[PDB]
Amino acid sequence: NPAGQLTFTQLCMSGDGYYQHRTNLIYSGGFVQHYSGSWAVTEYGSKFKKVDEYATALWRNVYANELKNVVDIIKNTSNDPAASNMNAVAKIMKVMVAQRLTDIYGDVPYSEAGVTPKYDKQQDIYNSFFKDLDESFTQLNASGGSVKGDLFYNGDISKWKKLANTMRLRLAMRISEVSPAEAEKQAKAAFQNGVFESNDDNCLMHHLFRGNGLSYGFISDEHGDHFSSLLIDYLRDNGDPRLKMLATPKTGSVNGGPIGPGEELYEGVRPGVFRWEVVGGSNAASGIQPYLKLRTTPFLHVSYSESQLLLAEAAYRGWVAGSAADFYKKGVEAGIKQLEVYGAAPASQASIDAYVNAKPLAAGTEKEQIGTQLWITYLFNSIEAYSNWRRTGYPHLLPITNSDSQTGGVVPTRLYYPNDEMQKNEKNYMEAVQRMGGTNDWTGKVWWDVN
C-alpha cells in the first residue's frame, strides 16, 4: 500500500485536470495574468467572476483524493525502522499537498483532516510545516529502508532531503511579511541544510491522472489560451531568451490578413480581452508552443530556479550569507534552462550569458526584479505565482477595468470554502469565518498576506 498510495498521490498532484484547469489555469493563472484569451480563463479568471465549482475544486479534490492517502502512508510506516525513509517522504509529500490548500483558502482542516474537523489557524499550519520538514530532513537516513513508488525521484533520499529544504525555504519566504524573525530563521536553516543544487534536482512528474492535468485544461479550452500581453511584452522588451521557447509567432497582422515583413511577431493578449476581440482577430496574437500543451508534457512542482531566486531575496534582506546578484543570476539561468525538459530548443549559452549580464540585479529594484523573475519561473504553476504576487505585490499587473468585473478590478486574494462546510461542519466553519472578520469571501485575506 505505501508504494501504491505514494504513486497515486504523486499522480494526483499534477494529473488531476479537474483543479489544474480550475485553480491553476483559470483562477490563479488569470488573477496573476499569466494567461488571457480563452472563454473560461478570461471570463472568470482574468475579469474576476465567481463560479463555486471553480473556486472550490482544489478543496474538494485535495480532501477527496490526496490528503487521506498521504495520512495513511504516514500512519502505516510510523514505527517500522525499515520504513522510516518512507515515513519521511510521505511527510514531505503531506506538506506539498497541504501547502497549496492553505495558501488558497487560509485556515483549513489539517491536523484533524484526512466528521467535524476544526480549521487550523494558518500560522499553526505553517509552524507544523516547518517542524515536519526539519525533522523529515534529519530522519532521511542510509538505514531508513527503501522508498518505493516514488515517481519524482525513484526513491533517491538525497534528492528528498534537498526537496524538503527547498520547500522549507519557499514557506520561509512566504511568511517574510507577517513573521520576519521566523521567516529569517527558517530561510537560513533551509539554506544551510541544503536546497536544490541544479536543475537535475527539480521536482517533476513525467507523464506517459496519467496525463498532465494542466494540458487537459489547455485542450478543453480548445487551444484558445494565449500568454498575457504583460508576460510577452516583458520577455520581448527585455530580450529574455524564453520568448520563443514559450510563444508561437503571430500568423496574422493587426490589420487583418497574413502578417507581413516588419510587423512585430510576438504579442500577448491583453488581460480582460478574449482572443476573438484582439484587433486583427486571434491570429494577430502569439500562441503557446505545442509541446507545452501535450498530455505527455512534464509538470514542474518545485525548481532550482525558484530556490536560487528565493535565496536572492533572502540575501537582499541579510537573512542568508552571500551576494543577492549572484543568486539572482543563477536563478534566471536555471529558469531559462528548465524549459528544455518541455521539449523546447535549448537556448545558446551565449544568449543566456548576454541576457543575464545585460540586466543584472539593480540598486533599488531588487524585490521588483526578483518577484518578476519568480513570476516567470512559476509559469504553469500559477498557484505559486498567485501566492508570491499576494505576498510581494510584484509584478505590477495590468489594471482590470472591465465593467462586468464582480470586484471592480480588485484582484481576489483567496478562494472561498464550499457551502457544504456550512451545512455539514457549521461550528468550525463559523469559527474560521469569524477569524476572517465575518466573511467567507474571495476578497478575504490569508494570514501571511498582510497587505
Numbering used by the authors: 36 to 149, 157 to 250, 263 to 505
Text from the published report:
The studied chitin utilization locus (ChiUL) is encoded by the soil saprophyte Flavobacterium johnsoniae, which is a Bacteroidetes member exhibiting gliding motility. The SusC/D-like pairs are believed to be specific for their cognate carbohydrate targets, and act in concert to bind (SusD) and transport (SusC) oligosaccharides across the outer membrane. The resulting ChiOs, and likely chitin crystals as well (analogous to the archetypal starch-binding SusD protein of B. thetaiotaomicron), are captured by the CusD proteins.
CusDI and CusDII exhibit comparatively low sequence identity (27%) and may thus have different carbohydrate affinity characteristics. In contrast, CusDII only bound chitopentaose and chitohexaose, with 10-fold higher affinity for the latter. CusDI features W280 and W65, whereas CusDII displays W330 and W74 that are located at non-equivalent positions but may nevertheless have similar roles. While both glycan-binding platforms overlay within the known glycan-binding site of SGBP-A, they are offset from each other, suggesting that ChiOs are bound differently by each protein. The area of CusDI surrounding W280 and W65 displays several residues that may provide hydrogen-bonding or electrostatic interactions with individual GlcNAc residues of chitin, while there are fewer such residues within the aromatic interface of CusDII.
